[PDB]
Amino acid sequence: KIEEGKLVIWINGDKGYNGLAEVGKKFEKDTGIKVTVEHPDKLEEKFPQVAATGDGPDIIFWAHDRFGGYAQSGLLAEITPAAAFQDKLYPFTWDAVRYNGKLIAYPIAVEALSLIYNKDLLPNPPKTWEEIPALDKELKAKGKSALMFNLQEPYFTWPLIAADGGYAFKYAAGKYDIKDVGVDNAGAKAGLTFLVDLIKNKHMNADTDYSIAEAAFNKGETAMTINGPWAWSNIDTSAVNYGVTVLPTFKGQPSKPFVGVLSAGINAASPNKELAKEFLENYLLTDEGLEAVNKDKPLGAVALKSYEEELAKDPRIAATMENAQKGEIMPNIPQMSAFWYAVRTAVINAASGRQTVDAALAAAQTNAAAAAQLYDVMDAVPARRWKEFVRTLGLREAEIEAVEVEIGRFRDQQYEMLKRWRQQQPAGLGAVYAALERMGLDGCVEDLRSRLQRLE
Numbered sequence: 107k108i109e110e111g112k113l114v115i116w117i118n119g120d121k122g123y124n125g126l127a128e129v130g131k132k133f134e135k136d137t138g139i140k141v142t143v144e145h146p147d148k149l150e151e152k153f154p155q156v157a158a159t160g161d162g163p164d165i166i167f168w169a170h171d172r173f174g175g176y177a178q179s180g181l182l183a184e185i186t187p188a189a190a191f192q193d194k195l196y197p198f199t200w201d202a203v204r205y206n207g208k209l210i211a212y213p214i215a216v217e218a219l220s221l222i223y224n225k226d227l228l229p230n231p232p233k234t235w236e237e238i239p240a241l242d243k244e245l246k247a248k249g250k251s252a253l254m255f256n257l258q259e260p261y262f263t264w265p266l267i268a269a270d271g272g273y274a275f276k277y278a279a280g281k282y283d284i285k286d287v288g289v290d291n292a293g294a295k296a297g298l299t300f301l302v303d304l305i306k307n308k309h310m311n312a313d314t315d316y317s318i319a320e321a322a323f324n325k326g327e328t329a330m331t332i333n334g335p336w337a338w339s340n341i342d343t344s345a346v347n348y349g350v351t352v353l354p355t356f357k358g359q360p361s362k363p364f365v366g367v368l369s370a371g372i373n374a375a376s377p378n379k380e381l382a383k384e385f386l387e388n389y390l391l392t393d394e395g396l397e398a399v400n401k402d403k404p405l406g407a408v409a410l411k412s413y414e415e416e417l418a419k420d421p422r423i424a425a426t427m428e429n430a431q432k433g434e435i436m437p438n439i440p441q442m443s444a445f446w447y448a449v450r451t452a453v454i455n456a457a458s459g460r461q462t463v464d465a466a467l468a469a470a471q472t473n474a475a476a477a478a479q480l481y482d483v484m485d486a487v488p489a490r491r492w493k494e495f496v497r498t499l500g501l502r503e504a505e506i507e508a509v510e511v512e513i514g515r516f517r518d519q520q521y522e523m524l525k526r527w528r529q530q531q532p533a534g535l536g537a538v539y540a541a542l543e544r545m546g547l548d549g550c551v552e553d554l555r556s557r558l559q560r561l562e
């Protein structure tokens with residue numbers, strides 16, 4: 107459990123938590139502060155349940171796409187590093203973790219998918235997605251396959267869909283518009299249709315996930331896979347001679363992977379914020395800190411400039427960064443949740459044949475665009491009435507109601523955050539104010555008197 111005088115960190119199990127634990131032991135050796143790293147299941151979903159409780163972590167690690175919601179709900183502490191420290195990380199990595207003009211996390215590394223081919227089976231990897239059907243059958247003649255990758259998570263199948271024109275939300279004037287969802291445009295329809303055709307000619311199987319796809323490549327059963335740097339570790343241990351190169355082109359235009367920024371967010375309810383800032387700045391985000399984690403599971407291209415020149419020499423990094431520039435940086439807005447869920451539903455149905463491509467994408471468009479609107483009213487729907495609300499609207503689509511749950515859980519962390527604040531323990535002042543300002547006249551007076559009290 108969390109309490110004053112120690113750090114608890116959450117990171118996804120596919121990353122190098124053991125190496126991260128090493129960095130904390132140094133910290134513990136230098137400060138006497140016990141550092142404990144955990145890797146829970148679905149920490150992306152478990153966090154918004156337990157953040158503002160005594161069961162949430164001090165530091166949370168995830169790609170930058172989740173943090174906008176976290177931030178909007180006032181569940182993160184404003185990161186306040188000196189200019190000299192900011193000038194040690196790449197500026198565009200700071201953009202990712204910047205939401206509404208405020209820094210909400212420490213950017214760690216850059217994550218971008220890449221084509222991971224087996225050199226023993228593929229000296230000249232294909233340049234285009236349209237070459238692959240011919241190569242696979244040639245490998246079918248060897249009882250082999252050309253490609254296998256996780257098909258259950260939309261993270262991995264997006265690069266092909268967004269190649270010719272598909273996108274999440276339109277970007278313009280330096281801003282995203284959540285009403286313009288580019289999941290059902292011409293460029294998106296072609297990518298998925300091309301993907302399914304690969305499966306329908308049984309160049310792939312729909313049940314392929316990370317665990318199995320990983321096994322396939324690691325045992326030299328498929329010539330290619332698509333995965334991130336964190337996966338090179340297990341592959342390095344396996345006896346496969348592999349290469350990491352650029353993703354294949356499609357219709358002249360490259361497959362555009364959503365680029366990820368691994369980021370470290372400080373719980374606003376953590377009683378050891380400065381204690382955390384000390385760790386991330388002066389231990390992890392150092393040439394040795396990052397080296398310790400990378401040795402466990404490769405991070406990719408780090409945001410720390412001093413240690414990026416070190417990794418840039420690795421061709422597998424050069425491959426990723428190329429794909430990174432070719433692809434797009436994930437938005438960090440609170441609506442990316444609505445976008446992901448809708449797509450996760452669409453691909454599984456268009457892959458299992460349960461629906462047309464035109465249908466799933468049409469439905470995903472609607473559900474995402476609609477569910478994306480729920481966030482603008484998250485703070486308005488008065489307290490005790492969020493379930494009555496969403497039940498009043500009665501949308502009932504599985505991916506839509508998933509956002510409802512999330513939002514319903516955000517509102518529950520803010521009430522909890524308010525509870526902590528009332529009892530004089532750490533709390534995020536935004537989560538507090540959002541809760542009072544929907545708690546009738548009594549909330550608003552309580553809200554403002556604090557705003558006035560706070561003016562000291």
Ligand SMILES: OC[C@H]1O[C@H](O[C@H]2[C@H](O)[C@@H](O)[C@@H](O[C@H]3[C@H](O)[C@@H](O)[C@@H](O)O[C@@H]3CO)O[C@@H]2CO)[C@H](O)[C@@H](O)[C@@H]1O
Pocket residue numbers: 118120150151168169170171172217259260261262334366443446447450
């Ligand atoms: O659809 C279910 C799932 O959608 C969301 O997951 C997305 C992540 O938010 C997003 O960061 C990305 O996930 C990848 C990570 O960025 C990266 O760290 C790496 O480890 O691979 C991840 C893919 O497994 O893309 C996924 C969509 O697949 C949402 O976060 C989840 O709550 C939700 O369960």
